[PDB]
Amino acid sequence: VTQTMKGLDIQKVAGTWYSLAMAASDISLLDAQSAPYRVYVEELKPTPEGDLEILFQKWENGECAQKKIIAEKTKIPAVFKIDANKVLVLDTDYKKYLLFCMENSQSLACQCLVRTPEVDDEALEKFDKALKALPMHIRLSFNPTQLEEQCHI
Amino acid sequence: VTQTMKGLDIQKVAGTWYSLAMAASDISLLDAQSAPYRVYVEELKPTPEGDLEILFQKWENGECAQKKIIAEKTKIPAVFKIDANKVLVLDTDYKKYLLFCMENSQSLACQCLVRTPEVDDEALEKFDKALKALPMHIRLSFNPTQLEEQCHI
């Protein structure tokens, strides 16, 4: 991944987000409700030290689980680390959309986050543009009804 | 779907094809190996009367089944009917790629077929252009190894 947000101000990503689209290098990373990278972002909670707490939903064992993880800052404002993985922030306008990618050490999943439960065509175009450079083999997007449901069911 | 092949000569689609990419209006139409529209085209066998016999693979009950169906001609050269559905041929150059869609009566799945087990970037661009007009919520594509395996496993 060679696209990062220049000048990212992590404090201004605080608050509510919706996983409007997802994409991944391998079909099995997103194909089932219980696939490893099928994660629905709910809320971003930046810390004063500049770590990113993430609230998300994940389907585990026929149930939509509410989950929490800390992404630790690095020397690069647009790149965080997660234990189990790099999180890279590609692009955001803070008020409407955020594009990000997660990568292990060849598995890659990226999302288009939006602030409201609405299909934002401009944000999906930028998402689409950013993926043109990436070896993606699965793409999902969700309608506004799914965006307001637990695990987008 | 409002894109059909003007002047389609059904006889010249005869022979070998590979399902390089698939897309569908609903995630559950393509998300599992056993999803209803997860069909891998193998061979097209036009009949003299101008019907289209289709050989395809489908994963049923932990097994890759070899299957056969007849798409009946209509008054439109680019549109066929299948019992269980309209099949529409959007675009083909006969020698390299064929784009088609299947629709019931709101469910819609489209494929990019190629002649050889190769990622044809030009054909994927046209596939991408044709889908811009369609309400797709899932896209898959397959690498050359998967293209040469039963059910693209």
Ligand SMILES: CCCCCCCCCCCC(=O)O
């Ligand atoms: C602005 C960055 C958004 C990052 C969201 C990443 C989601 C973390 C998912 C971790 C997977 C898991 O813990 O099961």
Ligand SMILES: CCCCCCCCCCCC(=O)O
């Ligand atoms: C040029 C047209 C290509 C058409 C291929 C259609 C595939 C048919 C799949 C039917 C589904 C089923 O019978 O289970």
Ligand SMILES: [Cl-]
């Ligand atoms: Cl999209």
Ligand SMILES: [Cl-]
């Ligand atoms: Cl594609």
